[PDB]
Design a binder for these strands. Structure first.
Ligand code: NA
Ligand code: NA
Length: 327
DNA sequence: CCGACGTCGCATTAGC
DNA sequence: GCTGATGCGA
DNA sequence: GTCGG
């Protein structure tokens, strides 16, 4: 639906969501407002009243009241106020820095540190992740066009294969669903030598190679199974350099790989629909496994999974292309 | 009325 | 020194 | 904040 239809309302709800998460440290209210913003965003009618909106799942009495106020006045008093508030707006802003959550933001603003400049002045009070977040503040908020994602995938698949041709690497996220743009790159990695029942340098060797060819530029965190860092496409001659990008790489046991690929391919909406289907067939599906219930409700062991289709087939669904998994 | 609301790897840190 | 809790991000 | 046991 066009933004013009209820964009004022959904923008209002998103802003409220952010203040709950970043200022009030109320994560569940944050997700309440987001859920309401999503369902309203998909509503194919211009909302005429709070009562109309309340019919939608996730919109309750209080959001109905806010919509009435917005419709009758074009603003929300509480939002106008908190927007104007020096401390609250500063706390909310600082959390746009990767690594600065509500708690770090609150602590910075308590001691007078309110802007990117104040951060730039006080690097010794920032941890490693936060420094990297500050360094790439602008780049990290840019989207990644699919053409660059393809170029990024090219490098990743190539370098992974150069390390060991028996690795299996899959770039997931909305990119795998064919999205025209991405927020970051999510790479799922496995290897036949790594199972649930079985080196812990499988991940390190791949990260090391990607650093060696100067694709990976910085590290946010890194252990034996999850890497989170920064990358950059090489610059095309006398052209402007590419933005730095967020890349995650996780190593998953072979027997849990395709469950992982399914899960991180999404979308979130499609995943829950599929998780519902789902139990009904007497199966529990999470990021790692699919398991049978269970006349009482006792999960049996993980069923063997050798492809995404294998999962679909357990729950008697026909395989669905990543492009067809928006819901 | 009142609890659930996703879960967990890694980095940092609090307490012993 | 170690272990557990918390913050953070996805 | 919303839902539902
Ligand atoms: Na409702
Ligand atoms: Na942040």
């Amino acid at each position: 639906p066009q933004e013009t239809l209820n964009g004022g309302i959904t923008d209002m709800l998103t802003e409220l969501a952010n203040f709950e998460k970043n200022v009030s440290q109320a994560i569940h209210k944050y997700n309440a407002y987001r859920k309401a913003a999503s369902v309203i965003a998909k509503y194919p009618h211009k909302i005429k009243s709070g009562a109309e909106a309340k019919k939608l799942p996730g919109v309750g009495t209080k959001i109905a009241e806010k919509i009435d106020e917005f419709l009758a006045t074009g603003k929300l008093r509480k939002l106008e106020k908190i927007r104007q508030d020096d401390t609250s707006s500063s706390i909310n802003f600082l959390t746009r820095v990767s690594g600065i959550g509500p708690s770090a933001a609150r602590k910075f603003v308590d001691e007078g540190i309110k802007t990117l400049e104040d951060l730039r002045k006080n690097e010794d009070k920032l941890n490693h992740h936060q420094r990297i977040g500050l360094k790439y503040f602008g780049d990290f908020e840019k989207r990644i066009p699919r053409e660059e994602m393809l170029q990024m995938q090219d490098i990743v698949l190539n370098e992974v294969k150069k390390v060991d041709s028996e690795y299996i690497a899959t770039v997931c996220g909305s990119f795998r669903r064919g999205a025209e743009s991405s927020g970051d790159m999510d790479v799922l990695l496995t290897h036949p030598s790594f199972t649930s029942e079985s080196q812990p340098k499988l991940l390190h060797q791949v990260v090391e190679q990607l650093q060696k060819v100067h694709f990976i530029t910085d590290t946010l965190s890194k252990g034996e199974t999850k890497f989170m860092g920064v990358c950059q496409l090489p610059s095309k001659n006398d052209e402007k350099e590419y933005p730095h990008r967020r890349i995650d790489i996780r190593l998953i046991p072979k027997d849990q790989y395709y469950c992982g690929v399914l899960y991180f391919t999404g979308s979130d909406i499609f995943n829950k629909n599929m998780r519902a289907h789902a139990l009904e067939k007497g199966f529990t599906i999470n990021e790692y496994t699919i398991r049978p219930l269970g006349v009482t409700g006792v999960a049996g062991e993980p069923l063997p999974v050798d492809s995404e289709k294998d999962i679909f087939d357990y729950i008697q669904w026909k395989y669905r292309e990543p492009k067809d998994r928006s819901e």
